[PDB]
Each structure stands twice: as C-alpha cells, then as structure tokens.
Amino acid sequence: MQKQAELYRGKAKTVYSTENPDLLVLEFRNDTSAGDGARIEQFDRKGMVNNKFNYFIMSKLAEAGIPTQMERLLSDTECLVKKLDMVPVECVVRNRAAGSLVKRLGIEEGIELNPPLFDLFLKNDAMHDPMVNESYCETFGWVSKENLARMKELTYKANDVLKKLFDDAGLILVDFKLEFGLYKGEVVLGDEFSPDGSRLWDKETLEKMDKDRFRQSLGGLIEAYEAVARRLGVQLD
Amino acid sequence: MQKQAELYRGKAKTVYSTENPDLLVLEFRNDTSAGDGARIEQFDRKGMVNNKFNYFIMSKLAEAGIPTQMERLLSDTECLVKKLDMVPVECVVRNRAAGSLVKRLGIEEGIELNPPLFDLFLKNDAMHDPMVNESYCETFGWVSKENLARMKELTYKANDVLKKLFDDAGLILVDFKLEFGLYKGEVVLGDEFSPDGSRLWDKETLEKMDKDRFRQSLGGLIEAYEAVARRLGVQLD
Ligand SMILES: Nc1ncnc2c1ncn2[C@@H]1O[C@H](COP(=O)(O)OP(=O)(O)O)[C@@H](O)[C@H]1O
Ligand SMILES: Nc1ncnc2c1ncn2[C@@H]1O[C@H](COP(=O)(O)OP(=O)(O)O)[C@@H](O)[C@H]1O
Ligand SMILES: [Mg+2]
Ligand SMILES: [Mg+2]
C-alpha cells in the first residue's frame, strides 16, 4: 500500500487515496496553525513526531479495546489508515480548566474538573469551530444518537486509559480532542492524538508541553513534544 | 402582601422580599438592555405589558400541567411569586433559526429546525452568558441530572403548548428562553416568558414582533409587544 493521489488536506495533514477503496494514507506535515486568525509556521520534525506519537497512542487505545483507524506506519511522516466517514464534530474532554474553557467561562486555568467536562465542537474553520450539543447532531444529521453515545463512551474510556499512561510518564493530561468516523457502519476512532490537540503539563512543575507553547509563543515547541515522546517511550530515531 | 425590601435586581426586573419568607415580589421595569454592551433604554409601558403578558402565558402553562412560581399579580407591573432557588442556566428551545444561532453557525435565519434545537446558557453578564452543556451542570453543581432532565422535559412541553397558542393568534413561536428554580426541592418554572426572551413572527408576513426589533434597530418595540398581547386576548388598559 502506497499513496496514489491527494484527495484533500487540512491544516496539519494531507490525505491520499490508495488502490484499496477502504484505505487511505495520512501524511503529517510540519504545518502548525493557531487561533481563529490562523497563523501557520513550519517546525522541523513536527510531522514525524506527531505521526509516531499518534501511532503509539492509537496502539495503546487499541490494546485497551478502542476500535481505531490504524493499520500501520509507512514512513517517518505517513501511516496507513482505514477510510472513515468522519463525523464533523470534535469531542473534547477536559480534566483541568484551560484553553477555550478559560476564555469562555472566565474560570481559573488549572482548576480540576470533577467529573471531567465534555465539549462538542462542529468542525468549521469559517465559523471557528462553534460549540454544539446533542440536539444539533440529531437536527442537522451529523451523527445518530446511538453513534454519538458510542463516541462519548469511547472518549471517556480513552481518557481513563491515557490519564494513567501520562501519569506514569510524570505528565498531567489536562484535556484532549478526538474525532470519530464510521467504518462499515461502526464507530471508529480516527484523525490523531498528539500535543497539537491535547494539553499536557509536567506533573511536578506544571510546565506546558503541548501546542499551547506555540499559541502563547513560549518557544521550544518541538523540544517539548519530543520530551513527552521520550517520557512515553516513543521511538523517533 | 407588599414589598418588604429590595433583595437584588437584574437588567429587567427588581426582586423584593415580603413578610412571607417563601414569597417574593417581582417588579417588571421599563428597562430594556440589548447587546451585552448594556445599551439600556427605557420604554414606557414595557414593564406593565410584560408583567401581564407573563401572567397570561404562565397561566396557560400551569393549566397544561407545568408547575410555575405564579401566585398573583399585585399591580400593573408587579407579581407575587414563590421564592425559588434559581438554577443559573437559561433553557432555550429553537423551532426556527434566529438570534445567536444564525451568527454562531452561519445558518440562514428562518430555517425550520426539526427536531427543534435545545441550548443551555450559563447566566453570566460579564461573560455574555456563555453556552454550556449537561456535563457542565454536573461538574460545577448548578443542577442535578434528574432536575436538569425535568427542566428540559418541561421546556419541551411548554414548546408544544405555546406553539399552538401562538399559531392560533397568527404568530410563529421562533424560539424562547426559560429559567427554572427549586421550590422545596421541586423544579418550578420561574422568571418570565415575554417578547424579551422569546422570538415571535407574524405567521403571514414574518414581521418580527419581539425584542429583536430593539436589538436590530427596527423600532416600534412596545407597539409590537402590545399587538402580540392583544392578539393573545390580553386587555392592556
Ligand atoms: N481515517 C480517516 N479517514 C478519513 N478522513 C480522515 C481520517 N482521519 C482523519 N481524517 C480527516 O482528514 C483530515 C485530516 O486533516 P487535518 O489537517 O488535521 O484537518 P483540520 O484542518 O480539520 O484539523 C480531517 O478532516 C480529518 O477529519
Ligand atoms: N421566582 C423567583 N424566585 C427567585 N429568583 C427569581 C425568581 N424569578 C426570577 N428570579 C431571578 O431574579 C432575577 C430577575 O431579573 P432579570 O432582571 O431578568 O435578571 P437578568 O439580568 O439576569 O436577566 C433573575 O436572576 C432571575 O433568575
Ligand atoms: Mg485536524
Ligand atoms: Mg432576565
């Protein structure tokens, strides 16, 4: 299985078709966007780190029983995945207050959330990914009630699994975003899990080591990404 | 019954205590606030119209079986109500796209929503009443799952009842906002139902006859409120 032609691309990955109608090639680019204003910069090794970081996390979730898109890595920046009919809704679980929650509610960053919060955002850059809820999914036909329930279920399961994984690595899983899609009628985890869409703080110093370093221009973005990879045991070289 | 002391006030009503610890007096002022930028304006007869308008609707909802705060009207602008431990979350049902939905999702105003949408907003002027969801209610303890389910159940019932009532009066109930509180542990409809928090369009011309006339500089606010009141059978003078 090799890339055939580019079908489409997003702000971080390029999607290619393959000879198989049910398999695609995801290419992680070095592109790094930010804010609703959207400012993009390229960071060396970024795509490769996220691709391998994603494979590692996806496998951990699969081992836990989470059905995923993953087939296998193809190169430093590419992987083979099942073609999914993506539900255009981001699922965000928050263990501590940060990002848009802090901006939206004016709550103090870092506040522990018990139980964790669960946000749903419609994927629409034009509208800056507006917040939605279950009624919207039904009314606009984005996903069935049964499938949405499954998505939330798998997200919370992923949260339980990953909070433990990151804790063992001396990290706090502040929050993260997931995207699911349908594969032959079944809900499957797709897209990616990396520091781009998940917040990770050092357990002892609370130092931010995810995309917030880029959003807040704190410097050392990729250095932080690789630091996290090393703590988890993700081979990069 | 008589007002004993002003407890507090919001942007449209003043809340007073009475000699009875379980009863309050609500005064509907002529104060009208549009745009969180609090561009207040006073409209003569506004308080009186909404007080009578609210009484009429609450009475209809009560007949339908919905528990409400209403005891009786004390004057043209005041009403005697049960003291409720208000849940700080607005419940909004949308039958057609309008207001913030249009600006939020970029959907065309007027589009019919099937099934209707249901929004939850945290009451917080400083933060412009940010949108929330059920997980927020549990995490921050604004209201239990059981009571929230009850609030939504009653809001949907109010929708079935009021859509018919307004249609009979040649009007389209576009959307509306309700607020509930607890009375000795039970969920009870409180606050108010008026053109201030509900969108109503003439069934034949679609002319707006609610607070949107003030929000969107169309003028004729009170004249519209009175026209709606009279169509419902409310005698204003
Ligand atoms: N397994 C998959 N099958 C099909 N599409 C997928 C799969 N995994 C991810 N996608 C989609 O491919 C795109 C990946 O690109 P990305 O640059 O992250 O986009 P975005 O700008 O929306 O963040 C997204 O639209 C995502 O939903
Ligand atoms: N029956 C009631 N018991 C107690 N508080 C009530 C009752 N009905 C309404 N309230 C509260 O009193 C206030 C009425 O004020 P209003 O001017 O509409 O406020 P706001 O500026 O928040 O819209 C609101 O905070 C409302 O929740
Ligand atoms: Mg993406
Ligand atoms: Mg109010």
UniProtKB/Swiss-Prot annotation, chains A, B:
One of its GO terms (molecular function) is phosphoribosylaminoimidazolesuccinocarboxamide synthase activity. Keywords: ATP-binding, Ligase, Nucleotide-binding, Purine biosynthesis. Pathway: Purine metabolism; IMP biosynthesis via de novo pathway; 5-amino-1-(5-phospho-D-ribosyl)imidazole-4-carboxamide from 5-amino-1-(5-phospho-D-ribosyl)imidazole-4-carboxylate: step 1/2. InterPro entries: SAICAR_synt/ADE2_N (IPR028923), SAICAR_synt_PurC (IPR033934), SAICAR_synth (IPR001636), SAICAR_synthetase (IPR050089), SAICAR_synthetase_CS (IPR018236). GO terms for cellular component: cytosol; membrane. GO terms for biological process: 'de novo' IMP biosynthetic process; cobalamin biosynthetic process. The keyword Disulfide bond does not apply. It comes from the Bacteria. Pfam families: SAICAR_synt (PF01259). Homotrimer. This is Phosphoribosylaminoimidazole-succinocarboxamide synthase. It comes from Escherichia coli (strain K12).
